[PDB]
Amino acid sequence: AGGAARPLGEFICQLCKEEYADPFALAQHKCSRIVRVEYRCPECAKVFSCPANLASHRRWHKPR
Ligand SMILES: [Zn+2]
Ligand SMILES: [Zn+2]
Questions:
Q1: Would residue 34 count as lying in a domain?
Q2: How far is CA 31 from each of CA 34, 37, 41, rounded to the nearest angstrom?
Q3: Nearest ligand to residue 10 Cα
Q4: From the CA of 57, how far away is ligand 2's center (Å)?
Q5: How far apart are the first and last CA of the chain?
Q6: Of the bound ligands, which one is closest to the alpha carbon of residue 28?
Q7: Minimum-distance ligand to the CA of 57?
Q8: Does a structural domain hold residue 36?
Q9: What is the DSSP string of the chain?
């Protein structure tokens, strides 16, 4: 898990989409992200480089 997580210290950019809860990483925050096709899943934090398998992966999160 990690602990009691919520929007505290974290800046989430709209354009570069970089997100850091670590205050040191906001001081080192460098806006410039080549974000072609990458989708992070909340629980399965490993990023998917494809949209189609991601859609089938959401079907895996869908109940009956
Ligand atoms: Zn940024
Ligand atoms: Zn997932």
A1: yes
A2: 10, 18, 22
A3: 1
A4: 6
A5: 27
A6: 1
A7: 2
A8: yes
A9: --SS-SSSS-EE-SSS--EE-SHHHHHS-------SS-B--SSS-SPBS-SHHHHHHHHHH---
**Cβ proximity of 19 and 11 under 8 Å:** yes
Cα separation, 25 vs 19, whole angstroms: 9
Tokens found for residue 40: 């992070």
Identify the experimental approach.
Answer: NMR
The closest ligand to the CA of 29 turns out to be 1
As for how many domains the chain has, the answer is 1
Q: Ligand 1 centroid vs 20 CA: distance in angstroms?
A: 9
> What's the domain range around 55?
11-61
How many CB atoms sit inside 10 A of residue 59's CB?
A: 7
Specify if 6 maps to a domain.
Answer: no
